[PDB]
Amino acid sequence: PYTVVYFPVRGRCAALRMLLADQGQSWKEEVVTVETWQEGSLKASCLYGQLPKFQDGDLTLYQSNTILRHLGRTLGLYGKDQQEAALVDMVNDGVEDLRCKYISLIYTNYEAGKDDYVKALPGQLKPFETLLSQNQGGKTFIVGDQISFADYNLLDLLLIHEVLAPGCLDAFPLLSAYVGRLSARPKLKAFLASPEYVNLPINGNGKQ
């Protein structure tokens, strides 16, 4: 039914994989090594010359957030109504903004930039704590009282930041509890513990 085409890294597929696993969906992983990519043929066929590429039957998609939104739309993980859908997008766009900064650090400026990045991190995380505080005291999900694709993306963002800056959630009780709660969902817990996840590096350059 579903196929994920990507490099052997967590990266921009981590959240959509968590979503699929937690939702009890089956999918095929099509692994593309850097050597295979460097040949050029698959890259030339990709819409924006990049991975992930995703297949849902005869539908082929590119763009990690398009894949998330598609799964959210088709699986009912996109809020209860239009108002919640907009809030879901607002969270996801915020997650994407911080992910872009994280990626820039990892791949272009790790040694020289890490200190300033970590110093700035609390101010980058506080909006998500605020979002939780304004939704049922943070006891459920990031938007409303059902899970959305933005929860999986935010969860991944938080997990990778815990590796980059251990203790970065200690000042944020709602985010800390939210990470624990979501990570304990049975199917997700099983996936996060699986070698499929654990034995992939977070990024492609050995930095985290």
Ligand X SMILES: N[C@@H](CCC(=O)N[C@@H](CS)C(=O)NCC(=O)O)C(=O)O
> How many residues bind ligand N11, per CB under 6 A?
10
Report if residue 66 touches its own copies, rule: CB under 8 A. Answer: yes
Binding mask 148-187 for ligand N11 (x = CB under 6 A): ----------------------------------------
- Give whichever of 97 and 196 is closer to ligand X, judged by the CB atom: 97
List CB contacts of 172: < 8 A, sequence separation 6 or more: 125, 126, 128, 129
Q: Is 64 annotated as a binding residue?
A: yes
Quick one: which of 11, 72, 79, 144 contacts ligand X (CB under 6 A)? 11
List CB contacts of 161: < 8 A, sequence separation 6 or more: 102, 121, 125, 168, 169
CA dihedral 127, 128, 131, 132 (to 10 degrees): -140
User: Around Cβ 23, how many Cβ atoms within 10 Å?
Assistant: 15
Binding mask 78-107 for ligand N11 (x = CB under 6 A): -------------------------x---x
Quick one: which of 36, 50, 108, 208 contacts ligand X (CB under 6 A)? 50
Binding mask 23-62 for its own copies (x = CB under 8 A): ------------------------xxx---------x-xx
Binding mask 107-126 for ligand N11 (x = CB under 6 A): x-------------------
- Give whichever of 85 and 168 is closer to its own copies, judged by the CB atom: 85
Q: Are the C-beta atoms of 52 and 64 separated by less than 8 Å? A: yes
Stretch that binds ligand X, among 43-51, 53-61, 72-80, 188-196 (CB under 6 A): 43-51
What is the β-pairing status of strands 27-31 and 53-56? unpaired
Which residues line the annotated binding site for glutathione? 6, 12, 37, 43, 50-51, 63-64
The residues that touch ligand X, with contacts defined as CB under 6 A, are: 11-12, 43, 49-52, 63-65, 93, 97
